[PDB]
């Protein structure tokens, strides 16, 4: 976004043997062909190469060194003012850094050799810290010096041979240095963590542009709290993109066997880190002395809470150094540092994003390529349930799921590394989508665990119903937008009803199976603590899980046996029930987001339902009570059947006519008994046969051993007069109580205008 | 196949127990034998089908040992009557060695359990502590 920004692309070269400066370029700079370029380099990367001006062959934008770039981490198109770097001159006998790994390749003493062909006319780019085409000993001989400060290169007469380290560098610290933490993941939080950081580049870059802003620089800030995503990669991406000592604490050096060991030297490394230069102060373990000893007893405690504020307060407080306020939790936190002063400065939040995590995704997966058919990005947007953070968790998945099917379709291989195994993981969604099966987000994964259920299409019945529940979900994963759009908002909560649980907790338990994001079901038991005063703190804990968790479908057992609150008295369990249900409708009313509510709970006694819930807001769709129709009852039975074995024998049109609205776990009952009928018969029989004969060959065909592969005719119609009703007279009660309950909250008329 | 209650270290200590009891027993089966323990006869004591089953009937879940604590049960030939229940629970019982034979043929999972409405007072814990003993 700078004049000095040309359209730097990738050089005919990835070294800077075929760049192409415009034009342009060697018009407006003085950007020759064979000159030293002063040029510019991200994570403090000096090139003072020699680009060649390409403009004969195209006059086309800035052509740029692939390779060095890459290895310099440079940017493509970055402001680089390329000017001459005749200043920077070398001393004769400098101390050239001879590497191990420039040594990895190259035979004899080719480092003599080499460094004759480099002291005069070295053919190379002048500079440090990128890829240079160095060929000697037939290997790539980079035994170069990492950086001077004065010329990087050899900017002394050719003959100046600088006197190289006697050492060799090992290849892995090479590796460790590239793969430093730069900007590039500090992606996201392109609002917050942007601003904080330009904050203090300015006061980097352009500390006299706040001085004359007429009122003080800020003297600090501190930095946002991170709900566990981890803000030690925040911290170090900004420490290596940061050229300041950042003295990085420890909750270790706050512990002191001598008496204010800790404390003192915690003063004196402030003390040090100031004097030495515009330092930082990488506090971690920010959330470690939280409360400001309010509550806390403990003495030595509070002599580290008093020398911290000592330190952050009093004269000179405002030196040129500032802290990160990398919080676990702000609520353990507290005001002796909230305040401009207090601290650096007042203090943010972090916290993860799906959208962006998208783009964070990208970053991830361009870490290591993995995939060339794999639509990664557009199935990360698809899976949103991801815990952002454990973005990371997925990918290692994917790799995993990757490595395991190339590792067991071959033997080790290690000679042999196959190009499918050696370049990436996959090349497609497979892997991608064994990590999805796989993967889960690990907070819930850690807070709850689940069984596994058929899909809400594996089971049928309600189809209206669970249309509607899959529109409400797709809704705002679909188009929210058009909800705005439409200039209104998503619907809260829903309630279930039908027969007394005859698979409404399994028609539950397969809605959640079928959903598509992440979904909780919560049991009345993990409701009261025995000791008093934490019940309600569980209550308020699960319910901040939940809001953390959005977007999470909540489901729970049944309300009307779990929560009575207007259903079982007006009194509630001792308060604790009323501060539940208080919280409840806290969390169904108030102020919040609520990415993804859900409401799951059956209809146990209409009666026993809480007004307060009942409302909208807390409940918007009704618990509708259905019960198996005799076309219902059908289709519930060839459903269940789908799963078995069933024979021609045994006709299901004459099952829905003896059904005359039985319940579908009746049905479910009636074939198991004549299951277990089948089962029995089918062991008699093989027992029979083994004992015919001492050598005799017993059941030869097992499915023809039972009655049949198949059910037998016979053994459902012996099930069936074994089999009792599930129409009750009380049954009739209830359903005329449910009734009531909707032809009240039914209005007579189509109210057509 | 019998030993399906308990697993683990309970199933090591099972394993100790038995060789426990049979070295008890040969121990025993002998006398002091301090002057001439005979080797062979130590590695003849082995382990005894029988004493294998002593310690495992003497042995039992680590879990429902801190959990549970049964009193003598009499064996469903000492119950009297309800061939058909003795049948259903003879039944349910099977059901654990073969279901997965059956869930393969037709696919259909068992029953929980049984409500015992029996008459009022007649005496139920006589037929769950027949149950008990038949129990594998």
Same mark, same amino acid.
């Given at each position: 976004n700078?004049?000095?920004?040309?359209?730097?692309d =990738?050089?005919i070269?990835?070294?800077?043997?075929?760049v192409?400066?415009? %034009?342009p370029?060697?018009?407006?700079?003085?950007?020759?062909?064979? !000159?030293?370029?002063?040029?510019?380099? /991200?994570?403090?990367?000096?090139?003072?190469c020699?680009?060649?001006?390409?403009?004969?062959?195209?006059?086309? /934008?800035?052509?740029?060194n692939?390779v060095?770039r890459? $290895?310099?981490?440079?940017?493509?198109?970055?402001?680089?003012?390329?000017? +001459?770097?005749?200043?920077?001159?070398?001393?004769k006998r400098i101390?050239?850094?001879?590497?191990?790994?420039?040594?990895?390749?190259?035979?004899?003493n080719?480092?003599?050799?080499?460094?004759?062909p480099?002291?005069?006319e070295?053919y190379?780019?002048?500079?440090?810290?990128?890829?240079?085409?160095?060929?000697g000993?037939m290997?790539?001989?980079?035994?170069?010096v990492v950086?001077? !400060?004065?010329?990087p290169?050899?900017?002394?007469a050719?003959?100046?041979?600088?006197?190289?380290?006697?050492?060799?560098?090992?290849?892995?610290?090479?590796e460790?240095?590239?793969?430093?933490?730069?900007?590039d993941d500090?992606?996201?939080?392109?609002?917050?963590l942007?601003?904080?950081?330009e904050?203090?580049?300015?006061?980097?870059?352009? +500390? &006299?542009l706040?001085?004359?802003?007429?009122?003080?620089?800020?003297?600090?800030?501190?930095?946002?709290?991170p709900?566990?995503?981890?803000?030690?990669?925040?911290?170090?991406?900004?420490?290596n993109?940061?050229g300041?000592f950042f003295?990085?604490? #420890?909750?270790?050096?706050?512990?002191s066997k001598?008496a204010?060991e800790? =404390?003192?030297?915690?003063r004196k490394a402030?003390?040090?880190?100031?004097?030495?230069?515009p330092?930082?102060?990488?506090?971690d373990?920010?959330?470690?002395?939280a409360?400001?000893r309010?509550?806390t007893?403990g003495?030595?405690?509070?002599?580290?809470?008093?020398?911290?504020?000592?330190?952050?307060?009093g004269? /000179?407080?405002?030196?040129?150094?500032?802290?990160?306020?990398?919080?676990? @939790?702000? #609520?353990?936190?507290d005001?002796?540092?909230? @305040?401009?002063?207090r601290?650096?400065?007042?203090?943010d939040?972090?916290? +993860?994003?799906?959208?962006?995590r998208?783009?964070?995704?990208?970053?991830?997966?361009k870490?290591?390529?993995?995939?060339?058919?794999?639509?990664?990005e557009?199935?990360?947007?698809?899976?949103?349930?991801?815990?952002?953070?454990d973005?990371?968790?997925?990918?290692?998945?994917? &790799?995993?799921?990757?490595?395991?099917?190339k590792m067991?379709?071959?033997?080790?291989?290690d000679?042999?590394?196959?190009?499918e195994?050696?370049?990436?993981?996959?090349?497609?969604?497979?892997?991608?989508?064994?990590?999805l099966?796989?993967?889960?987000?690990?907070?819930?994964r =850690?807070?709850v665990?689940?069984?596994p %259920?058929?899909?809400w299409e594996?089971?049928g019945?309600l189809?209206?119903?669970?249309?509607?529940?899959?529109?409400l979900?797709?809704y705002?994963?679909?188009?929210?937008?058009?909800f705005?759009?439409?200039?209104?908002?998503?619907?809260?909560?829903?309630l279930?009803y039908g027969?007394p649980?005859c698979?409404?907790?399994?028609?539950?338990?397969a809605?959640? #199976?079928?959903?598509?994001?992440?979904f909780i079901?919560?049991?009345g038991?993990?409701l009261?603590?025995?000791?008093?005063?934490? *019940?309600?703190?569980?209550?308020?804990?699960?319910?901040d899980?939940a809001?953390?968790?959005?977007?999470?479908v909540?489901?729970f057992?049944?309300?009307?046996?779990i &929560?009575?609150?207007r259903?079982? #008295?007006?009194?509630?369990?001792?308060?604790?029930?009323?501060?539940?249900?208080?919280?409840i409708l806290?969390?169904?009313?108030?102020?919040?987001?609520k990415?993804?509510?859900?409401?799951?709970?059956?209809?146990n006694?209409?009666?026993?339902?809480?007004?307060?819930?009942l409302?909208?807001?807390?409940l918007?769709?009704?618990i509708?009570?259905?019960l198996?129709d005799?076309?219902?009852?059908?289709?519930?039975?060839?459903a269940?059947?789908?799963?078995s +074995?069933?024979?021609?024998?045994?006709?299901?049109?004459?099952?829905?006519?003896?059904?005359?609205?039985?319940?579908?776990?009746?049905?479910?009952?009636?074939?198991?008994r004549?299951? /277990?009928?089948?089962? @029995?018969? *089918?062991?008699?029989?093989?027992?029979?046969?083994?004992? =015919?004969? %001492?050598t $005799?060959?017993?059941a030869?065909?097992?499915?023809?051993?039972?009655?049949?592969?198949?059910? @037998?005719?016979?053994?459902?119609?012996?099930?069936?007069?074994?089999?009792?009703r599930?129409?009750?007279?009380?049954?009739?009660?209830?359903?005329?109580?449910?009734?009531?309950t909707?032809? %009240?909250?039914?209005?007579?008329?189509?109210?057509?205008?």
């Amino acid at each position: 976004n700078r004049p000095n920004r040309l359209i730097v692309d =990738e050089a005919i070269n990835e070294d800077n043997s075929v760049v192409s400066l415009s %034009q342009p370029k060697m018009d407006e700079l003085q950007l020759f062909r064979g !000159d030293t370029v002063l040029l510019k380099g /991200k994570k403090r990367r000096e090139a003072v190469c020699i680009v060649l001006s390409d403009d004969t062959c195209s006059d086309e /934008k800035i052509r740029m060194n692939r390779v060095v770039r890459n $290895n310099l981490r440079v940017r493509l198109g970055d402001v680089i003012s390329i000017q +001459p770097c005749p200043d920077v001159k070398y001393g004769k006998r400098i101390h050239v850094l001879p590497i191990d790994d420039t040594v990895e390749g190259i035979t004899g003493n080719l480092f003599e050799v080499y460094l004759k062909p480099y002291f005069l006319e070295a053919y190379r780019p002048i500079r440090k810290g990128d890829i240079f085409l160095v060929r000697g000993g037939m290997r790539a001989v980079e035994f170069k010096v990492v950086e001077t !400060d004065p010329s990087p290169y050899c900017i002394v007469a050719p003959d100046t041979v600088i006197h190289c380290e006697g050492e060799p560098i090992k290849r892995e610290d090479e590796e460790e240095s590239l793969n430093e933490v730069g900007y590039d993941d500090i992606g996201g939080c392109r609002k917050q963590l942007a601003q904080i950081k330009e904050m203090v580049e300015l006061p980097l870059r352009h +500390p &006299a542009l706040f001085k004359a802003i007429g009122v003080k620089p800020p003297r600090g800030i501190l930095l946002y709290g991170p709900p566990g995503t981890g803000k030690t990669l925040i911290a170090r991406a900004v420490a290596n993109e940061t050229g300041a000592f950042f003295f990085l604490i #420890n909750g270790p050096e706050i512990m002191s066997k001598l008496a204010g060991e800790s =404390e003192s030297n915690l003063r004196k490394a402030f003390e040090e880190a100031e004097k030495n230069a515009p330092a930082i102060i990488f506090i971690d373990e920010l959330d470690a002395i939280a409360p400001k000893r309010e509550k806390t007893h403990g003495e030595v405690e509070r002599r580290i809470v008093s020398q911290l504020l000592t330190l952050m307060d009093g004269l /000179k407080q405002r030196a040129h150094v500032i802290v990160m306020a990398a919080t676990n @939790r702000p #609520n353990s936190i507290d005001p002796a540092l909230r @305040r401009f002063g207090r601290f650096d400065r007042e203090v943010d939040i972090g916290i +993860p994003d799906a959208t962006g995590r998208l783009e964070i995704l990208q970053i991830h997966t361009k870490n290591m390529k993995l995939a060339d058919d794999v639509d990664l990005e557009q199935v990360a947007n698809e899976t949103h349930g991801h815990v952002g953070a454990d973005l990371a968790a997925l990918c290692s998945e994917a &790799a995993l799921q990757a490595i395991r099917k190339k590792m067991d379709l071959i033997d080790l291989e290690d000679e042999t590394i196959d190009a499918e195994v050696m370049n990436s993981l996959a090349v497609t969604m497979d892997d991608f989508r064994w990590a999805l099966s796989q993967s889960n987000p690990s907070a819930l994964r =850690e807070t709850v665990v689940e069984v596994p %259920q058929v899909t809400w299409e594996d089971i049928g019945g309600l189809e209206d119903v669970k249309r509607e529940l899959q529109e409400l979900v797709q809704y705002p994963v679909e188009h929210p937008d058009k909800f705005l759009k439409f200039g209104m908002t998503p619907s809260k909560g829903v309630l279930f009803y039908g027969p007394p649980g005859c698979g409404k907790t399994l028609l539950a338990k397969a809605i959640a #199976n079928e959903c598509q994001a992440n979904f909780i079901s919560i049991k009345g038991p993990e409701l009261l603590t025995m000791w008093f005063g934490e *019940s309600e703190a569980n209550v308020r804990e699960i319910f901040d899980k939940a809001r953390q968790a959005a977007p999470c479908v909540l489901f729970f057992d049944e309300l009307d046996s779990i &929560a009575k609150a207007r259903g079982g #008295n007006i009194g509630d369990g001792g308060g604790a029930a009323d501060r539940v249900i208080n919280q409840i409708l806290t969390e169904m009313d108030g102020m919040s987001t609520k990415k993804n509510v859900f409401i799951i709970g059956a209809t146990n006694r209409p009666d026993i339902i809480d007004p307060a819930i009942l409302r909208p807001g807390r409940l918007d769709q009704l618990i509708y009570i259905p019960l198996p129709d005799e076309k219902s009852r059908v289709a519930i039975l060839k459903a269940n059947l789908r799963k078995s +074995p069933v024979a021609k024998d045994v006709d299901l049109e004459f099952l829905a006519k003896m059904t005359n609205g039985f319940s579908g776990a009746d049905l479910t009952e009636i074939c198991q008994r004549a299951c /277990k009928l089948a089962i @029995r018969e *089918s062991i008699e029989s093989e027992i029979r046969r083994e004992r =015919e004969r %001492q050598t $005799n060959p017993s059941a030869m065909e097992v499915e023809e051993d039972d009655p049949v592969p198949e059910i @037998r005719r016979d053994h459902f119609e012996e099930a069936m007069r074994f089999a009792r009703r599930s129409v009750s007279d009380n049954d009739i009660r209830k359903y005329e109580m449910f009734a009531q309950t909707l032809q %009240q909250s039914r209005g007579f008329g189509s109210f057509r205008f």
